[PDB]
Amino acid sequence: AYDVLIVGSGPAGAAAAIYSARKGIRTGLMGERFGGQILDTVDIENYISVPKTEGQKLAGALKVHVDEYDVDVIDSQSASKLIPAAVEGGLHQIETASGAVLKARSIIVATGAKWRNMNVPGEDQYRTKGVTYCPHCDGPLFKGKRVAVIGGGNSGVEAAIDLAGIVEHVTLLEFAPEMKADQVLQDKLRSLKNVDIILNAQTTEVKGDGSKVVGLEYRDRVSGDIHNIELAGIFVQIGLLPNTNWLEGAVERNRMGEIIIDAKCETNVKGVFAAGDCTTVPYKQIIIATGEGAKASLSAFDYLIRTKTA
C-alpha cells in the first residue's frame, strides 16, 4: 500500500512523484511509458528556463530527477479500473490491464491525453518534420511559411488565428459543413486576410520531400474531388482525447472527458487527485503539466495528514 500511487508517468506524473517522494512517503509511479507525450517530439523551446531541449533529453532528465528520490517506478502497465475506498480513510485500488491490483492511501491520476490523428499516409513520416499537434509549441517555427490547421473547433480556429499573426498564410480544413468553434472565433478567423477556410475537407495525405512537409492533399466530402495545397506545416487540431475512459463512473469528468478538478487538483473522490492533460486544466503544455503534478502531490500529502488510516 503506497502512501501515494501516481498513474501515468509523463511530465505531470513525474513531477508528482518527485514532490511526493521528497516528503519521504511511499511513492509509486505507474505508467505505460515514462516521459509521456514528450517522448515523440524533438525540439522543445517553451519549457521555462530551458531555451531549447528535446523530448528524449527531457524525458531522460525527468527520469534522473525522479530517481534521485525513493520512487517505485513501474513501467509498461496500464490502469484499467479505480476502486474507490469503500470507507473514509480506506485504501484506494488501481487494477491494471495485465491483471494486477495495487493499493494506495491516495491516488494521483496523470494519464494525459492523445491528440487525434489525421490517419493518412505521410503523417507519421513527417511528425516533427512539419506535422505538429501543438500550435503553442511550434507556431514560432513557421515565420514566413504557409501552414494548415486541421480542425474547426475552438482549438483549431484559435490556432489558425494565432498562426495567422506569425506565419505567411494559414489554411484551416474543417471536415464538417460548418465549424463548431464559438461564433466570435469564427468571425475573427474569417476576418483575417492571410487565411482561407475549407469546409467539407478531409485530408487524405501528407506530402514531403523525404525530409520535411511540402504539401497536403485532401478530399472534398461533397463532390469527392481531390485537391492539393503547398505548405510547410500542418497543425492537427482535430481533438484531444483524455486517457480517462477507464475511470468511467469512478471519478467525475466534464463533457470533454477531462477529469474535473478544483484548484487543489482534487476530484470528487476524497484522496483521489488528478494532474495534467487528463484534467480540466485549460491548456495542455509540459510546463503546465509539471506545475499541476506538483500541486496534486502537495494536495495528496495534505489529504494523508488530515485523514486517519482505515
Ligand X SMILES: Cc1cc2nc3c(=O)[nH]c(=O)nc-3n(C[C@H](O)[C@H](O)[C@H](O)COP(=O)(O)OP(=O)(O)OC[C@H]3O[C@@H](n4cnc5c(N)ncnc54)[C@H](O)[C@@H]3O)c2cc1C
- Which residues are CB-contacts of 193 (< 8 A; sequence separation ≥ 6)? none
**HSE value, Cβ hemisphere, 13 Å, CA-based, for 230:** 2
Joined grid coordinates for residue 226: 481531390
Buried b (16+ CB within 10 A) or exposed e, 131-163: bbbbbebbbebbeebbbbbbbbbebbbbbbbbb
Look up residue 286 and give its amino acid: I
Contact status: 160 vs ligand X (CB under 6 A): no
Closest Cα to residue 230, out of 213, 245, 246?
213
Q: How far is the CB of 45 from ligand X (least distance, A)?
A: 7
150 is in an annotated binding site: yes
Among 71, 82, 134, 232, binds ligand X (CB under 6 A): 134
d(CA 127, CA 79): 28
Contact status: 40 vs ligand X (CB under 6 A): yes
273 is in an annotated binding site: yes
Is the Cβ of residue 243 or residue 297 nearer to ligand X in the bound state?
A: 243
147 is in an annotated binding site: yes
Q: How far is the CB of 89 from ligand X (least distance, A)?
A: 25
Contact status: 61 vs ligand X (CB under 6 A): no
Contact status: 54 vs ligand X (CB under 6 A): no
Judged by CB under 6 A, the chain residues 71 through 130 that form the site for ligand X are: 78-79, 110-113, 115
158 is in an annotated binding site: yes
d(CA 162, CA 250): 37
Query: Is residue 45 within 8 Å of 29, Cβ to Cβ?
Result: no
Among 23, 56, 125, 137, binds ligand X (CB under 6 A): 137
71 is in an annotated binding site: no
16 is in an annotated binding site: yes
Is the Cβ of residue 139 or residue 153 nearer to ligand X in the bound state?
A: 139
Query: Is residue 273 within 8 Å of 261, Cβ to Cβ?
Result: yes
Burial class (CB in 10 A: 0-12, 13-18, 19+), 209: exposed
Contact status: 253 vs ligand X (CB under 6 A): no
Among 186, 243, 297, 299, binds ligand X (CB under 6 A): 243
**HSE value, Cβ hemisphere, 13 Å, CA-based, for 265:** 32
Contact status: 242 vs ligand X (CB under 6 A): no
106 is in an annotated binding site: no
Closest Cα to residue 297, out of 98, 108, 59?
108
What x-and-dash track marks residues 172-191 binding ligand X by CB under 6 A? --------------------
228 is in an annotated binding site: no
Among 2, 133, 218, 303, binds ligand X (CB under 6 A): 133
Judged by CB under 6 A, the chain residues 262 through 291 that form the site for ligand X are: 276-277, 284-287, 289
In sequence order, what DSSP letters do the residues of 140-160 get, joined into one string?
GGGBT-EEEEE--SHHHHHHH
Contact status: 158 vs ligand X (CB under 6 A): no
Contact status: 141 vs ligand X (CB under 6 A): no
The site for ligand X (CB under 6 A) is made up of 7-13, 30-33, 36-38, 40-41, 44, 46, 78-79, 110-113, 115, 133-134, 137, 243, 246, 276-277, 284-287, 289
